[PDB]
Amino acid sequence: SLALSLTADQMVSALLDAEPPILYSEYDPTREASMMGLLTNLADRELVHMINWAKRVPGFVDLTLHDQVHLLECAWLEILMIGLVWRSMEHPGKLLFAPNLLLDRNQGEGMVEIFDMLLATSSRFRMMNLQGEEFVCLKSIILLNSGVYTFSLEEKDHIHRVLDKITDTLIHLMAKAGLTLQQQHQRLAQLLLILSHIRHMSNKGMEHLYSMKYDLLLEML
Amino acid sequence: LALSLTADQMVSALLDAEPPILYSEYDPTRPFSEASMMGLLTNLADRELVHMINWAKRVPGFVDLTLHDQVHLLECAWLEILMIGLVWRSMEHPGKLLFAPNLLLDRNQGEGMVEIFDMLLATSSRFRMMNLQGEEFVCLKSIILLNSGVLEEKDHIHRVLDKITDTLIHLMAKAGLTLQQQHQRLAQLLLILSHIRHMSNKGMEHLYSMVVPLYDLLLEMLDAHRLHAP
Ligand SMILES: Oc1ccc(C(=C(Cl)Cl)c2ccc(O)cc2)cc1
Ligand SMILES: Oc1ccc(C(=C(Cl)Cl)c2ccc(O)cc2)cc1
16 A cells, blocks of 8 residues: 555645546537436436546545445545536536536426525635645545445545545645645635535435436446 | 634633433333424423523624524534534444443444444444544534524635634643644544435434424524523
């Protein structure tokens, strides 16, 4: 596990380098059972990239296959959502699901509360001046903190140590950016508190998906 | 004045404001059925709710918010608040959930509840494993309240949240932790809050598929005009 020996810069470079691409919504001019189909199809494609992203998250492959599957199983929607919020950040009042799918709230059945929360997190990130380097650290934290409470025991400890490294990385990014010590802790806290909003958003999102109606996962890991 | 508090004054304010520990109704009718246990828990929850509202009003910055925002924060946080309290109480009772000194329950006593209990016990164990301190607990609880549903007081709320962060840090420094340990523990603590949110959503899921008089209580007790509510 060279992962516990990574420096702040190495962790960032690894994470930046592992970023999935921004995918496009399926193009077909003729055509919300259709609108949800657009989002589900984007989601499925995004999932493939996410799983291979997860394998490049330092310390992730050191885990057993059982736990890798479980972490991804708990965090996938949270991860999809934070990506979405990151993409929408420079489009106030709009959610950028894809470059060719930029929806306002007016265009958002039980998705309305979801969108408003997503939009609010987007603006929150906007006024915090969230940086790409910080964003990838956060995304990684979601992956690892997803189902750690729930699930070798040593396995839990490895996760915890890597989380500590990501915390150090975040702090280092802020110090370099010239934040004072006090400012560093406050912003660390602000970022992490937004993670609970993300979890909330995911839970509500995961119980609307059930108002409708694994293999591929173990396959790739 | 709220935003003018030192760390030390902030922590003693929160400690002074702590609600009491309540006892479950003494209808000990055991063994429990689903109806009887939920009946008992709900009655406990309802009585705690009263004390929670009083507590909230003493959290620095809370009464600064509009009535609508006070109600919203409590609506969003109340179950998270009850659950963190339970986790704190159960901390020195491994394998058990101390809902009340007279209502100790283990996993083999909880039934969609089982999953929720398992989550509560895991968190409780996590608290123990990182040696969570009373001063830290009260900070986290206030953060849960102010972060549950956080347009001029979105900024006022964030100012108070910052002061609470400064207080948690200050407590860790006083304790003698290095700066690196401070940052790391702060992170570990706040990351737990995402799990508490999760357990709360799952709990609210179990409840609503089956209660507490939240809206009316807030109306009675958040009424600045009422002197002896509810
Ligand atoms: O990049 C994203 C793609 C879809 C979504 C969905 C939301 Cl906000 Cl509900 C979504 C995910 C899975 C689905 O089957 C439908 C929508 C979120 C982010
Ligand atoms: O101090 C507590 C009391 C009850 C509970 C409940 C759980 Cl764990 Cl589900 C609870 C809350 C509201 C209810 O109507 C029933 C149970 C949690 C903490």
